[PDB]
């Protein structure tokens, strides 16, 4: 049919989870420096 809205939605979630994890821990790294 058209644009894979659901697929995009999934990779969005994935993207966001990666960012909260990374930046989340990047934070803690400096907090412990």
């Amino acid at each position: 049919e058209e644009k894979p809205k659901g697929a995009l939605a999934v990779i969005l979630v994935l993207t966001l989870t990666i960012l909260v994890f990374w930046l989340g821990v990047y934070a803690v790294f400096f907090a412990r420096g």
Partner: protein
Amino acid sequence: DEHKAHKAILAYEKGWLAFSLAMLFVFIALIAYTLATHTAGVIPAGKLERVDPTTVRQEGPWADPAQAVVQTGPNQYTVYVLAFAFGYQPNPIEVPQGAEIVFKITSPDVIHGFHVEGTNINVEVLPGEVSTVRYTFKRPGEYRIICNQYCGLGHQNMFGTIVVKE
């Protein structure tokens, strides 16, 4: 339909790929950043520094625990630490705040971990090798060292102590 879907999907796919690589490179940069700061001190020394684990506590920098700390700069102290089956030497390790502490840690038996609760010091300690890490405490006080690498039946109880003096 279906053949339409195909082009769309493969389109967005290349998009997603370009985006993903971009975000990965952003991480690559932010890592390279930390490697340029003071905080990169915790990265173990790259150079090989071989010692004999069976004579470590009989002759050398690790023999006498009363010789463990040694001022080696104007604001630099080298601490010779020994992680051994189920403890740390010296215990406690006593250091000044705001000084650069250079740890040189080894083991007379098996592999231990050297994890300083509250810091970025997290280094494996291998018998026959010196693990050299640098760190400057900012905050005072009671830092606990935890062994985080399975060493035997008393592993879970292998703690140590840092006293960083105000």
